[PDB]
Design a binder for this molecule. Structure first.
Ligand SMILES: [Mg+2]
Ligand SMILES: [Mg+2]
Lengths: 165, 255, 205, 267
């Protein structure tokens, strides 16, 4: 009708991400603001998203704006140590859903790297392995048709041939 | 992956037009072989317009080989010929685009009801603009099973009968249409939950297995392996009904 | 995963102004990023759409169905022509036979056009000159041979041309199964999502 | 000309089929409402039934009507009965499988007089009136030309509501599969009967059918050159829900084949 192409993603969530994305990270800004609500907001005129380099600017930036006191900048640098450690820890956590279990590790032809490969397609349980054929479990980096075949067979023994769990 | 399916659906539409336009003439197996050959002819000649080098596998003359052996094209311009013989309006053209031994594209097209199910890895299985889902069942209560009888291999029938018997004591009802490809297409759109057949042949169900798989389902041979590609003792559906059916049908194995 | 670290490295390995930070002060002045103001200044020879230019070259080549060697030959032949080169390219590439074939539907594709010109199905000036590399002068009549106008191919392709956009600059005779050309189409009657001045500056820099 | 009651019935069937088809493209509105052992009765069945009854009442406020849902709505002139199935094979509709039909038959003095079945999906209209025959959108219907059991296609329904006889049925099934060519199982006895009238199946049989389902097909196959019977050649079928039908010779062969396997419960 409108002729204008349309896009439908969200209206409350995930929509500021298009334009209000550099001001919507509620964690750090408000975790610093809860004691700043008496003092002030934060200084938006610099991005400081990439806080590392732009924090190594002289008194000019610290003189121009108030609220980011010298002990404030130093305590917040310790908290930014906490923040870079938080980024590293989030990196660590983002690599946790692979699900190597005994029901998924000791099976024939399954090393821990076979676990990492099968979940590298998105298999976070054993039943999922029994929910694909050789054609669909393909494209794995180092998984032929007969190996995956016997693996599907093992999954369907532990699941569907003995009809158990 | 677009242009392969493009040629596929082009040949499918032309073949269906031919089949229907012919079906509008009266009669009371000469004619069906005539129209089968004519449809295959139009299909292949429209194919050679693009990639006249892929190896075509029909259901009649074995494997019409080609100079570019990277892609096989499984063809059946008519399945369940019995239908078109006896005027029953239920039959579809089945085209399958397979590569390296496995299949990538599939198109089944019913001319009469003008249904057209496409399917391809990742991009899913569509019915003229529908992200198909398969059925929603998780059990064998209030469910439908698209069955199939060995109208050429009646020896299994007895144990087959047993299966039916036990199946009837478990499931809710049965269906039977004769077009195995259409059974597959129906389990793809969840029109019927589970499908099974004794001793089919790849030229027919090649596209249908790709359909049911792409629609979130899975296939199997009677003994859970994958020799179906050579044995055609198919059992297909969403994993729920496949377990709920295999658990009760494997104990009567004869193939 | 929050980007709270190296900015020089980030916006240099990305090399573009994605607008992560607002960027209130001039970016190039804060540090030595690869991007300098006054775009035409620091890299004085610079052609806009610097990476897509060759992709659009392959596009015009796929619609022409031609190769690079004869493309550069046409280029050197057109550089000798007095006048605007940005239009003379498309003019000399329009004065050929296979293009007007794709128009009048001998072959519905310019590649099928080259096939039919190489298939001895194109009588030009009433003479069999099947080499596709001629410049059939405008104001000329071309058709298919007199013993092949009942074919499935010819009837199908001519009906196809009838079903495509009918050129006002090429009198297509679907009953006479031919085409009569008068003059190459000017700036008005060509595609409006194409680049030639950029191609001219790339071939003339 | 045309038979009047037939005409009003086909108008009713057209309206009902259009309603069903219109609702067929919104499976989020029609729910599964079960009645007995896997005999769903969705609200769409109720709506189609009401539409048919309304359309009839215009032209016969006095004719007693019968319906699986509303039982038997008496009329001031109960010599003529209107048997209806607004939907046949409710299961095929709930699974959104596009193979079902509405069936309207009119009996006079007990003997069935006119019948129509309508499939909206394929848009096929099997009409039949005694003393004039059966038509499929304008073509006469002389059933299958089969005269044996070889090469014959047998449509059937399974007792999936009277599963006690399952074995028995299955038993006979096996016997049949030793002589016939292939089976058909569609899920709507009305449409199966219709196909018998069109020769698209060389015969048909079923156990456990309600009296308000074959009433629209038995006349169809009868005026289609075919015949019906119980599992023994009698006529108690109207009470046993056990039907076997087809062209005469095939019916004879089937009866002679089935009489032995038959469990004496149905006899
Ligand atoms: Mg076939
Ligand atoms: Mg009913």
């Amino acid at each position: 009708l409108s002729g204008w192409e349309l896009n439908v993603m969200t209206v409350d969530d995930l929509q500021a991400k298009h334009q209000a994305e550099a001001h919507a990270a509620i964690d750090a800004f408000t975790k610093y603001l809860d004691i700043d609500e008496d003092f002030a907001t934060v200084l938006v005129e610099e991005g400081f998203s990439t806080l590392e380099e732009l924090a190594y600017v002289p008194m000019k930036e610290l003189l121009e704006i108030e609220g980011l006191d010298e002990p404030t900048v130093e305590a917040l640098r310790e908290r930014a140590k906490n923040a870079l450690a938080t980024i590293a820890q989030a990196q660590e956590e983002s690599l946790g859903d692979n699900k190597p279990a005994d029901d998924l590790l000791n099976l024939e032809g399954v090393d821990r790297d076979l676990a990492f490969k099968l979940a590298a397609r998105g298999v976070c349980t054993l039943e999922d392995l029994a929910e694909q054929g050789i054609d669909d479990l393909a494209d794995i980096e180092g998984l032929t048709d007969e190996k995956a075949g016997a693996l599907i067979m093992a999954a369907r023994n532990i699941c569907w041939f003995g009809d158990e769990a | 992956m677009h242009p392969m399916l493009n040629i596929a659906v082009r040949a499918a539409r032309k073949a269906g037009n031919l089949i229907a336009k012919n079906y509008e003439t009266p009669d009371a197996n000469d004619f069906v072989t005539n129209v089968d050959k004519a449809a295959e002819a139009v299909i292949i000649d429209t194919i050679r317009k693009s990639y006249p080098q892929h190896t075509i596998i029909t259901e009649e003359s074995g494997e019409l080989e080609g100079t570019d052996q990277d892609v096989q094209w499984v063809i059946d311009p008519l399945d369940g010929t019995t239908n078109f013989i006896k005027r029953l309006p239920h039959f579809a053209v089945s085209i399958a685009v397979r590569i390296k031994g496995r299949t990538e594209v599939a198109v089944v097209y019913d001319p009469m009801r003008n249904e057209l199910f496409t399917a391809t890895r990742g991009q899913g299985a569509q019915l003229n603009g529908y992200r198909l889902r398969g059925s929603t069942a998780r059990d064998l209560d209030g469910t439908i099973l698209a069955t199939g009888f060995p109208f050429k291999a009646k020896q299994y029938a007895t144990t087959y009968i047993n299966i039916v018997g036990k199946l009837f004591n478990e499931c809710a009802d049965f269906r039977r249409t004769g077009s195995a490809a259409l059974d597959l297409a129906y389990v793809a759109a969840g029109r019927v939950d589970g499908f099974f057949e004794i001793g089919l042949r790849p030229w027919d169900f090649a596209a249908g297995e790709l359909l049911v798989r792409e629609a979130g389902g899975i296939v199997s041979d009677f003994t859970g392996g994958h020799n179906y590609m050579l044995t055609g003792n198919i059992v297909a559906g969403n994993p729920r009904v496949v377990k709920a059916m295999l658990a009760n049908m494997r104990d009567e194995l004869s193939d | 995963a929050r980007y709270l670290g190296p900015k020089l490295k980030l916006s240099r390995r990305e090399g573009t102004d994605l607008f992560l930070k607002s960027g209130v002060r001039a970016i190039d002045t804060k540090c030595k990023i690869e991007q300098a103001p006054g775009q035409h200044g620091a890299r004085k020879p610079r052609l806009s759409d610097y990476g897509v230019q060759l992709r659009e070259k392959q596009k015009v080549r796929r619609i022409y169905g031609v190769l690079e060697r004869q493309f550069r030959n046409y280029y050197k032949e057109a550089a000798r022509l007095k006048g605007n080169t940005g239009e003379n390219l498309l003019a000399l590439l329009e004065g050929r036979l296979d293009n007007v074939v794709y128009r009048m539907a001998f072959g519905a594709t310019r590649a099928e056009a080259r096939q039919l010109v190489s298939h001895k199905a194109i009588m030009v000036n009433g003479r069999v000159v099947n080499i596709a590399s001629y410049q059939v002068s405008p104001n000329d009549v071309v058709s298919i041979r007199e013993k092949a106008k009942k074919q499935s191919r010819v009837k199908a392709a001519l009906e196809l041309a009838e079903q495509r956009e009918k050129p006002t600059w090429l009198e297509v005779d679907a009953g006479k199964m031919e085409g009569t050309f008068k003059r190459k189409p000017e700036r008005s009657d060509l595609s409006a999502d194409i680049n030639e001045h950029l191609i001219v500056e790339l071939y003339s820099k």
